[PDB]
Amino acid sequence: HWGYGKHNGPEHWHKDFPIAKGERQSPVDIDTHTAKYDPSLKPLSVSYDQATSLRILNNGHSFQVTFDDSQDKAVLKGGPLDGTYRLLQFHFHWGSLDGQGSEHTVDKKKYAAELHLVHWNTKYGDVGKAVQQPDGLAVLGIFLKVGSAKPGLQKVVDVLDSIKTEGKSADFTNFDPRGLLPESLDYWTYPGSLTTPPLAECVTWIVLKEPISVSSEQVLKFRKLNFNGEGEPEELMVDNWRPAQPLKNRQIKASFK
Numbered sequence: 001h002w003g004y005g006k007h008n009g010p011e012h013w014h015k016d017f018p019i020a021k022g023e024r025q026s027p028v029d030i031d032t033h034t035a036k037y038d039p040s041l042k043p044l045s046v047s048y049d050q051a052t053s054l055r056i057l058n059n060g061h062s063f064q065v066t067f068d069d070s071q072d073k074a075v076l077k078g079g080p081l082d083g084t085y086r087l088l089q090f091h092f093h094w095g096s097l098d099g100q101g102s103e104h105t106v107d108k109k110k111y112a113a114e115l116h117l118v119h120w121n122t123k124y125g126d127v128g129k130a131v132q133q134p135d136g137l138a139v140l141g142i143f144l145k146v147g148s149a150k151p152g153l154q155k156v157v158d159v160l161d162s163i164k165t166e167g168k169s170a171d172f173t174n175f176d177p178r179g180l181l182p183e184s185l186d187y188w189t190y191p192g193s194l195t196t197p198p199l200a201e202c203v204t205w206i207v208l209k210e211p212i213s214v215s216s217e218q219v220l221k222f223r224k225l226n227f228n229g230e231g232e233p234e235e236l237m238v239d240n241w242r243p244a245q246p247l248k249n250r251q252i253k254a255s256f257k
């Protein structure tokens, strides 16, 4: 099955998922001098006051916090987006070392990790239909660097002991994802893909310019998760990131100059 190892990693995914070599694949490198400032872009609308976290899960490739997306409780709108997108889940991608782990890169800079808040477009009724659409998903990507701790992440960090291995899950209610945001909502945006199988080219990517800082103790707790399931040889869940893909016929736009 696909993964991040030597024989099943990103260079192998195209065999089961040919779109891996597609025309709008993610992640990409964001060349900050090539990105064009688009003043017709709008401020992002991040409406997370009514979010309903449900459960946290080790899915064998990352850990995920899922929300109630049966109503417009936590939505993203504005920016380059038409319509309302509902928050389904967030997860991260991270490294074995602080100099690597993000999927997007900024002028080839790799961040220690990248947070992905996954939203689907309500005009398509469910996430399974959205992923079949060129504008089906909006993913808000936030870079993590190692520095001061991020207080809003500590509730997540403290429960990872209970979901160490693949397919473990736990209650995770009343978590407020507003605690993971930076101060600025300035962003880059381009049309792209899921960065894990099926690599569907359904994503409007919205990548915030500003990292959040997390502590070394917080990120070290990511690195104690396992790719494997209980009763299997231990393999630490590190370097679960896809590297940058060719931009091809695409222009990265910036909401800021």
Ligand SMILES: NS(=O)(=O)c1ccc2o/c(=N/O)[nH]c2c1
Binding pocket: 116, 117, 118, 139, 193, 194, 195, 196, 197, 198, 199, 203
């Ligand atoms: N890593 S990502 O581009 O935010 C992302 C988000 C939602 C996803 O659902 C997926 N199918 O199992 N892959 C995937 C990647």
Ligand SMILES: [Zn+2]
Binding pocket: 091, 092, 093, 116, 195
């Ligand atoms: Zn992701």
